Amino acid sequence: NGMLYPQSNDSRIVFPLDGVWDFRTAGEDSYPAEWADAPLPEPLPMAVPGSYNDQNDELNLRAHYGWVVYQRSFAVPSRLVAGQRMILRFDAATHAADVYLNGQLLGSHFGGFLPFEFDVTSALHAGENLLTVAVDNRIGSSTLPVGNDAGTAFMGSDNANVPAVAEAKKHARRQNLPNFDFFNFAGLNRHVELYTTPADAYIADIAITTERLDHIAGDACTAANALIAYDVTFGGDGRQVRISILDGEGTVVAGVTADIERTAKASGEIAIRDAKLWNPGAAYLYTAVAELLPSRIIDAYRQTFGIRTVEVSGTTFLINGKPFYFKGFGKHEDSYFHGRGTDDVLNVKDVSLIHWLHANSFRTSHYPYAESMYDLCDREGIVIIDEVPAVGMSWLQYANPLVAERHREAIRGMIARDKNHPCIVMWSIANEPGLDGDGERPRQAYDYFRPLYELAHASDPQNRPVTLVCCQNDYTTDITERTMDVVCINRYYGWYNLSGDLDAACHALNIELDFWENIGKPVMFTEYGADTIEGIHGTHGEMFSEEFQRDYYARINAEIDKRPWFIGEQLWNFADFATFQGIIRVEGNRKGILTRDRQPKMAAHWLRERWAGIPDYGYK
Amino acid sequence: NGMLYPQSNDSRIVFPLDGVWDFRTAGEDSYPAEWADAPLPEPLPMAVPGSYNDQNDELNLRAHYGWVVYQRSFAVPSRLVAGQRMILRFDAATHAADVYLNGQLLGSHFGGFLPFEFDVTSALHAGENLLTVAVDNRIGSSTLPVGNDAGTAFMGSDNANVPAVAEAKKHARRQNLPNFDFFNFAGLNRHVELYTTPADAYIADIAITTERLDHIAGDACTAANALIAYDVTFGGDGRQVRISILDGEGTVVAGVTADIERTAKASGEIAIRDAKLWNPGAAYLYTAVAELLPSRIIDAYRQTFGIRTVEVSGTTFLINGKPFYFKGFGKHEDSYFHGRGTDDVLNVKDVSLIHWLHANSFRTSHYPYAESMYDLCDREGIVIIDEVPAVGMSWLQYANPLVAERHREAIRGMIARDKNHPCIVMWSIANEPGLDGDGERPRQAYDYFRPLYELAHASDPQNRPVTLVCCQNDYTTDITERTMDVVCINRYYGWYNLSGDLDAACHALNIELDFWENIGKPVMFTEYGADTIEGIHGTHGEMFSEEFQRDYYARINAEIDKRPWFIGEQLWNFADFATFQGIIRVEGNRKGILTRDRQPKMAAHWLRERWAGIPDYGYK
Ligand SMILES: O=C(O)[C@H]1CNC[C@@H](O)[C@@H]1O
Numbered sequence A, B: 001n002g003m004l005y006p007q008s009n010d011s012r013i014v015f016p017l018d019g020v021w022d023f024r025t026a027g028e029d030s031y032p033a034e035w036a037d038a039p040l041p042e043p044l045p046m047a048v049p050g051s052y053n054d055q056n057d058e059l060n061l062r063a064h065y066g067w068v069v070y071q072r073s074f075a076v077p078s079r080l081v082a083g084q085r086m087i088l089r090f091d092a093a094t095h096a097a098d099v100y101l102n103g104q105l106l107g108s109h110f111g112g113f114l115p116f117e118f119d120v121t122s123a124l125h126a127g128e129n130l131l132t133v134a135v136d137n138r139i140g141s142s143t144l145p146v147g148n149d150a151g152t153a154f155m156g157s158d159n160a161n162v163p164a165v166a167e168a169k170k171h172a173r174r175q176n177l178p179n180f181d182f183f184n185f186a187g188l189n190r191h192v193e194l195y196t197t198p199a200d201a202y203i204a205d206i207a208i209t210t211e212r213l214d215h216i217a218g219d220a221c222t223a224a225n226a227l228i229a230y231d232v233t234f235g236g237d238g239r240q241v242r243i244s245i246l247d248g249e250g251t252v253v254a255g256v257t258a259d260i261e262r263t264a265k266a267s268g269e270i271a272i273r274d275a276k277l278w279n280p281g282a283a284y285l286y287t288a289v290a291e292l293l294p295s296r297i298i299d300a301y302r303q304t305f306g307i308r309t310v311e312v313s314g315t316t317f318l319i320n321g322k323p324f325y326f327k328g329f330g331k332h333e334d335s336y337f338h339g340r341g342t343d344d345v346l347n348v349k350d351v352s353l354i355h356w357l358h359a360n361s362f363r364t365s366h367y368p369y370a371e372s373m374y375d376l377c378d379r380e381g382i383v384i385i386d387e388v389p390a391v392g393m394s395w396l397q398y399a400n401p402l403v404a405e406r407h408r409e410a411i412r413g414m415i416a417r418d419k420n421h422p423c424i425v426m427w428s429i430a431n432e433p434g435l436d437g438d439g440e441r442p443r444q445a446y447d448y449f450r451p452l453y454e455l456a457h458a459s460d461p462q463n464r465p466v467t468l469v470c471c472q473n474d475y476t477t478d479i480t481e482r483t484m485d486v487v488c489i490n491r492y493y494g495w496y497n498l499s500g501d502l503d504a505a506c507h508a509l510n511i512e513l514d515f516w517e518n519i520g521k522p523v524m525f526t527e528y529g530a531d532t533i534e535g536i537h538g539t540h541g542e543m544f545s546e547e548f549q550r551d552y553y554a555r556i557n558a559e560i561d562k563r564p565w566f567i568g569e570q571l572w573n574f575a576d577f578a579t580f581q582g583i584i585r586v587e588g589n590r591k592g593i594l595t596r597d598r599q600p601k602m603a604a605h606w607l608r609e610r611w612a613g614i615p616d617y618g619y620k
């Protein structure tokens, strides 16, 4: 279950395998087996990590349907593999992968946004090793995220009653049709690395929780006492682990030696006096150093954490007992050449833009992001809502056992990967599933999602709030969204309805806010916005102008400011991003307040001024 | 000398000749004179009024050098012409024109921005008449506006030391090289019309002046008494003219009968009790109706006017005795298909944008505008600085008597055309002539311009202030600008110098403002700005971004606000406009706060908010 990010220390070394690999496209539903057994014939270069789709302009890899095959060679000194346990980790392969080393199948994985690994201790040999990775991009009614098996991509146009169209559909080239509004970027989107651990006994997992804070300071910077809990899991085979707690300067401030008991596990609690708390806008990180003891150390791992509590109380969202207000947006992992490929230069820039805007938060719309972004937000004081790739779902998916299992895998896998981050304050178990309607449909949706809500709570040792991000719907027949811990709504009054009429949009919004006012839950926007082409201007801004986007937020935000139970504003989107092509997507989704190259539109400046005057705590 | 705009009434009729004419291009230095004798061979269509340059995409008329020939036919009933004096009026033919009617050369005109007319009574005949107009676009060292005889256009790039460049220049196609930063649009840019007056005696010119205001209300809306004077000139041959003054509702509020004395003139004064004054932001217009008396009326003309005084006093600019502050910009007559062609839809729209912006004024950079725009600003309460086409001048021109004569012609013609407009508060006798330097250059410039300053004063019966718009220069050796009635300066600190460094730009500006503080004259900007491409954005705006343009005005305006003697801010420009092509002009000049299609950039919104808070009177 543990998926600790690979670390190098006195006991452990990481050997990255990123770089320019060999690559070939393959078939709609197969690829040649012999490509795992010998060097790829006539290979193309392909950089990893990165989506493959925008890395070759001679081919139209955006249109590719099915498999591709990556390959590279590598060699490491026998000295450093001798006696060690050898693990090959894929941070992400989107969506499914088969992995081979030296002509041997290592195994496969489904799930394009979470890491997986293989023990290669026995498949490795000295000299050059040949690593082959086949990656499948296909999506459909059984995948998360969901594809459409026929018809159109999400918000695509059709003339389905025209006989010629119906007939041409039967013979059209197979293409993935996302039931979600972002491009289906595929390939080795995140890092690949070989790493070592000791073989006889090793640290497999660590969970740190903030159990209780006694007497939090008025400014929330410290607490008189913090009770933290640790849970260390071991692999391999009267043994002990030493746990040292280091503060922000590396000083040892606490330490215990705990007994390992047979899963081999050690768990306990540690009191940290005068603890320095983690807050939005004021991060503070500790390190838990776990050392497996035999003066010598057998194994070690350093786990960053921050001390803070999260609690929903009535219509408030309390961080360290203080009423928080979210300011931010949904993001995407999306950029020009990389596609969905992780890029830490861009992550660093985006975090600085979050600060420039005076925002404090975002959601990982619509899939878990690369692990390095959460470390960055841990150090930079930015709060995250962590979301699984359960986007595009409807009643067709609720009746499918395979989908339900993939959904539980994604929830368990996201929380197992991300549980130690102090920046994560809430889990989202889906984006815009179908919840409303007549007959049994609302109850069917509820019966599908309630066990997943329970699973997210059971899986997280911090027991953080759980939400489900709700599409614009008939809120009077949806019986699911109102049962979440925080109500997170996506609304486009004045854009997809009441188009351009901000008076009517605000009237409609206020009618629905009157509905939520009586529910007793904290409510926030997780999306709202307007497609905007930079450089389109008007004195009376119409849809797609920079002025209309600014006016849109000015009018809507004035209405939610009147509601004390409305605890956050996350807009859509941080920045323009790529989508499947169609008649409503002008080079992708243009609801960004920043352009795809991260330049600010008029509305970004307006928002920056607004958010500069809204405090993280106590706004409401 | 009078050029009253043609009017239709019981004594007079106007027959417009606009529409789609026939057109041919001709030679660099000649056209076929026989084209006036018969319909043009194989003619192109060409709408009038309009520049010709953008009306044909099969030809490259922007590259044309030399002559073109317009032609059309017309017929009018014998009853219309019988007994009448028939005048053919060209509102503007840019730059020079030869006019033929039924093969007879009527005459020629130089000066591309002011009207001229011919008596055609004897050249007309019954049935179809054939009107042929040859128009010359050429500019050079003796024209106003000034062209360069060799080298490059204004702020063009060159590599003049490369031998191949020097040689190719000798054989390059002839092309006009503007020594001014706007495109040399040519042709019948303004209306053409045939009009009638009585033949025996007729009204030839009217001047109305505001002589004195007694007891002006605190809000300047009225005066207890206003003394106005009239001066009517007659043509033809104990006769009398009735002068009636009509208020805003058409009510005759005053009337006098004057004796015509011989060059036939009638002159006198009228006192208007509780006169409603014309003010920026609060226009009020009277009509002076002059009726030539024999029961019957022989001739009549209705002249609009507004009652207001203009006086420079110390460092203030007094309208109706109140300290005025200019808010506005230089403009251009420039638009997509029309070029420099007059377009009243666009004039109406532009005056509404001036109100939207909360501006109160503009300058007719860099030529007299179409007459209809001044009538519009009369009714809409927008102040005008009226400027002759003396742009591009330096010491080569001051030594040329043909240029001095053309310059005197332009000044007399502008003031004779425009003297009755209340919206005009100041005359500009040149834009950015060479004034500074060493040796005898500063004195030579002074001796050239001082007589023209005196000429503008002698020509205007209202005796309004006279300025010269000064280019960015060494203000310590320029001895001419400081002798103007208002000092009008164009400054581009932080754009063309100290580029992008707004701290240094403001420091430089303050050093020069310290200079003008000691001179003791009222000072205003007539230009300052930054080229800006809509849709270019940055968090720290660099040159060409929307943010830089906004920051430019925010920083510069903060500095002039500290100077009580700085009486106005006219920026460059209202809207992006066309120029000769070159390496610093991205589809023309982009210093507009509006795009060429009149859409607001970020700076326009900022300036609108600034100008909303600055009163027309009493800001300083
Ligand atoms: O339509 C939109 O702009 C948004 C609607 N909510 C879901 C987003 O993925 C999508 O991009």
Ligand SMILES: O=C(O)[C@H]1CNC[C@@H](O)[C@@H]1O
Residues within 6 Å of the ligand: B180, B181, B182, B366, B432, B490, B527, B572, B589, B591
């Ligand atoms: O350089 C500029 O942008 C301006 C400088 N002053 C004169 C203007 O005609 C010109 O357009």
